From TrEMBL, chains A, B:
Protein name (record): AmphB
Assembly and interaction partners: Homodimer. Pikromycin PKS consists of a combination of multimodular (PikAI and PikAII) and monomodular (PikAIII and PikAIV) polypeptides each coding for a functional synthase subunit which participates in 1 (monomodular) or 2 (multimodular) of the six FAS-like elongation steps required for formation of the polyketide. Module 1, 2, 3, 4, 5, and 6 participating in biosynthesis steps 1, 2, 3, 4, 5, and 6, respectively.
Binding site for NADP(+): 233-234, 255-256, 283-284, 309-311, 334, 371, 400, 405
Source superkingdom: Bacteria
GN (gene name): amphB
Residues of the full protein shown: 2529 to 3001 of 3190
Organism: Streptomyces nodosus
Binding site for NADPH: 233-234, 255-256, 283-284, 309-311, 334, 371, 400, 405
């Protein structure tokens, strides 16, 4: 029990100091998405930054054009104190890349083009409702949430020219304005912040509360349960667990379906346990196929739970290199699939709606910006669903042993050297069960060697995020 | 900052497993204080334990009489599963020992007499409002809180016949009753518990969160500040610090007053810093002298803060030996003095009301039951005051270097061997300033060698209290 407790961490938000009252001495550069600069918070922030602030309208998604334009701006206007991006407001999906929110595409390209141009002023990315900071806070935009996953990775890959992320409240009044312009003057080493009516909060990682035997909350597993990526490594083990725990009917999907490696053996394993098994070949981002799958479910085994395990991590790239095509392919199974699952089951009163995220989204991982963004959407969607009165749980895995992506010895070796150790499947699944029995909204379930991880993580830049993990503080002291 | 952060720990409460639904198999022995058995919670608990439970009425405070009565009960009634003491309900002060709550005296004598008689069943001590467990919880009886200090020391000295402490909610309904009788059946290795509407909570020690720079909310030090025991080791250094921070007037008390060792030198030191100095000889348990002291404060320098450093630790004794006279003498400067300070200043809108407690109260110290009880009252009074809308901060010191009680080489050497290391005064006082800038209600400020402390503390019996200190868990693995 306590060994599985030790795997579970959550994100919390702690109150930090009120900022100072002077605006930055040097000039700001504000970056605006010209089709998506009407939102009240975008107006309010532009007003806060004041008329001396240089505006750059980021048109389209043209890296080379922006790099040239930013190079000219630097030449003409000189050096800036910071760059303040309002690109998050662009939530609409990119015309050519249907799983990529325009504001996410534009933020990637902005980070690239700033590098290209030699504009080194720290980049701050603003969002409105991209995080749930505080008890009772509503995460109203899970699309903007995805941007925090990307931003953390820009912090790891370009630490010297990264400012951070700030979430604005719903009403940016003079108190909020002053807190923003104060933070831009000096943020006291914080870089993941939320401005709220009550003050400024910052993001923290903490050990989760221990599991409570007799916890209640979780209904018995029964009826039909959909596992996307259910023929995959983690998905297969999850299916077996659900079969052990009394599911009537497991519906496993993946793009290869019944032709997936080892699907025949998985079906036999599950059917031995007395469970009906359906394996469908089905892109999780295909809305029509999902609708058709749901319409077919037995009347005596209604859908009770979704476990969304569909995902790829390959053909990512460093922030400086990543293409929008690569980004799209990483977002597809995550953002587009999870949005379809959310919309199509919202009326079904599920017992569980479980999304498989990653540490890459929770703390960040160099070389994995597209995977981080994709998985950070899932974490955000879960909070968002809770605000609607719907069940959701996002489980941000560390590293799995035995099955799944991380079983390549080269990947495994890199992960161990960063101190994210491989979990035994029974311990990982037991920790997940603890999470679902608590009915927690979001958790990271990971085996950390903090003595390896904290120094690696903070080599080039401090992390306020880890200040609430005593082992991390000890390792760094 | 981070060195002072490292000194600070907090008591928190985590939800634990729900117990089983069956009564203990064997018979219970309930111990009641016959003049103080009318409180609703005492009725509710008696009703919960059921009519098969043997009742023992603990009359007076006669160790030998009780030992003989318990010896006869054992002979006649046979062996018990546990002994459940309701003696805490007796809050009135002992007629012969004016600083000792009757229930505290009776609980000591019960623990003694059970040992005398050979009645070995684990002893559980129940309280109602003696701890503040959970957000928003009201510690309504700081007198009953004192019993927790004693109980932890009974756990250390008589580990094989100590059950633990359980705090009941204000309304002991059927759900609370079942949690009580379940814990008495089997408590899963827990022994400091609080039963609340939301579940069963257990007591934990944890690192405090690192201070957030720039974020203080402590008002300026100004006016008159009363330091009881202000001529003593810690108290003198505290006085100097308060002078540096802007106090207009330091009022230092102790029983010897101006005849205290070094008092002339301390007065001159403070006068150099530009403050008015009053050194008064008086017992801090003397209500009338405190009143007279407060009445004569300059009109230009009203009382703004109390720092309660008055205390003695000598002429304590093991639980098996401690007399009520010894207990009284250890309680006097803590319970009686702090009650007078609380009552006489409650209407003065103080900025600070700081009570100097001890690790001996927070985790417990073999050989120090009376000192532990006395200091545990202070920690409880602080919570209690907060529930009334009054300021309070209890700081449970570990070991001070350089000045004060622990500078006796023999005491110093014992403490180091237990892993409670001597703090430098500037680091201790700096950690106290962090606490007051956070406006925390209670904290322990201590330098621990956990590799020495954890094994010593747990040699005879596990401590769920330490399960939240990662260094302690590591030392024991
Ligand atoms: N392994 C680990 O340590 C960690 C895993 N995770 C997450 O856990 C989940 C499972 O990972 P894991 O089991 O290790 O990896 P696997 O590759 O073994 O499983 C991924 C599954 O998703 C399927 N899939 C991928 N794209 C799609 C899509 N568009 N539509 C439907 N199915 C798709 C794959 O099958 P097909 O190719 O046939 O579509 C495969 O069955 C992933 O979402 C991953 O991001 C996160 C953190 C760490
Ligand atoms: N030193 C340490 O490491 C720790 C200290 N503490 C607490 O800190 C406080 C200060 O300890 P420290 O400075 O080391 O010890 P000291 O003995 O140096 O100081 C204690 C002071 O309290 C005074 N005092 C004792 N009884 C009374 C009373 N009835 N009325 C008024 N004053 C009285 C003493 O003077 P007089 O005898 O003249 O009255 C003395 O000035 C104590 O309360 C102690 O319990 C707790 C944890 C550890
Ligand atoms: C392939 C299976 C899988 O999901 C893999 C990619 C993962 O689990 S990726 C996440 C593993 N690594 C991380 O989470 C650690 C990221 N942090 C690290 O400590 C890195 O060393 C730093 C220095 C920050 C540079 O990125
Ligand atoms: C005299 C000045 C003073 O306040 C001194 C006595 C103190 O600091 S007392 C508290 C010092 N010691 C402790 O707090 C550790 C007590 N715990 C210990 O670890 C003991 O070895 C055990 C094994 C539990 C038996 O009591």
């Amino acid at each position: 029990g306590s060994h599985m407790d030790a795997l579970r961490y959550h994100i919390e938000w702690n109150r930090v100091a009120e900022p100072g009252t002077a605006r930055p001495a040097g000039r700001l550069l504000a970056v605006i998405s010209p089709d998506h600069a009407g939102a009240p918070w975008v107006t309010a922030v532009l007003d806060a930054l004041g008329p001396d602030t240089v505006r750059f309208e980021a048109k389209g998604t043209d890296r080379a054009a922006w790099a040239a334009q930013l190079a000219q701006l630097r030449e003409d206007e000189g050096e800036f104190h910071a760059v303040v991006s309002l690109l998050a407001a662009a939530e609409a999906l990119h015309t050519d890349h249907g799983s990529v929110p325009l504001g996410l595409a534009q933020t990637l390209l902005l980070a690239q083009a700033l590098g290209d141009a030699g504009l080194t002023a720290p980049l701050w990315c603003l969002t409105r409702g991209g995080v749930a900071a505080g008890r009772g806070d509503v995460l109203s935009s899970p699309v903007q949430g995805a941007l925090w996953g990307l931003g953390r990775v820009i912090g790891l890959e370009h630490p010297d020219r990264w400012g951070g992320l700030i979430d604005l409240p719903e009403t940016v009044d003079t108190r909020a304005a002053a807190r923003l312009t104060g933070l831009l003057a000096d943020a006291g080493g914080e870089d993941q912040l939320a401005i709220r009516g009550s003050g400024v909060l910052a993001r923290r990682l903490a050990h989760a509360a221990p599991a409570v035997p007799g916890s209640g909350k979780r209904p018995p597993v029964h009826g039909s349960v959909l596992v996307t990526g259910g023929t995959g490594g983690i998905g297969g083990r999850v299916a077996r667990r659900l079969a052990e725990q009394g599911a009537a009917h497991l519906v496993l999907t993946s793009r290869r379906g019944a032709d997936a490696p080892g699907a025949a053996e998985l079906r036999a394993e599950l059917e031995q346990l007395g469970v009906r098994v359906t394996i469908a070949a089905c892109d999780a981002a295909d809305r029509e196929a999902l609708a058709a799958l749901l319409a077919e479910l037995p009347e005596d085994a209604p859908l009770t739970a979704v476990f969304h395990s569909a995902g790829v991590a390959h053909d990512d790239a460093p922030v400086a290199d990543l293409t929008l095509g690569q980004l799209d392919a990483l977002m597809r199974a995550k953002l587009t699939a999870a949005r379809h699952l959310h919309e199509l089951t919202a009326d079904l009163d599920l017992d569980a709606f479980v999304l498989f995220s990653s540490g890459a989204a929770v703390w960040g991982s160099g070389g994995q910006p597209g995977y981080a963004a994709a998985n950070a959407y899932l974490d955000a969607l879960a909070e968002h669903r809770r605000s609607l009165g719907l069940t959701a749980s996002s489980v941000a895995w560390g590293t799995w042993g035995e099955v799944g992506m991380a079983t390549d010895p080269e990947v495994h070796d890199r992960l161990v050297r960063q101190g994210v150790l491989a979990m035994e499947p029974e311990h990982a699944l037991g920790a997940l069960d603890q999470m679902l029995e608590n009915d927690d909204t979001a958790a990271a379930i990971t085996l950390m060697d903090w003595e390896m991880f904290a120094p690696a993580f903070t080599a080039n830049r401090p992390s306020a995020l880890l200040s609430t993990v005593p082992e991390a503080v000890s390792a760094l002291s």
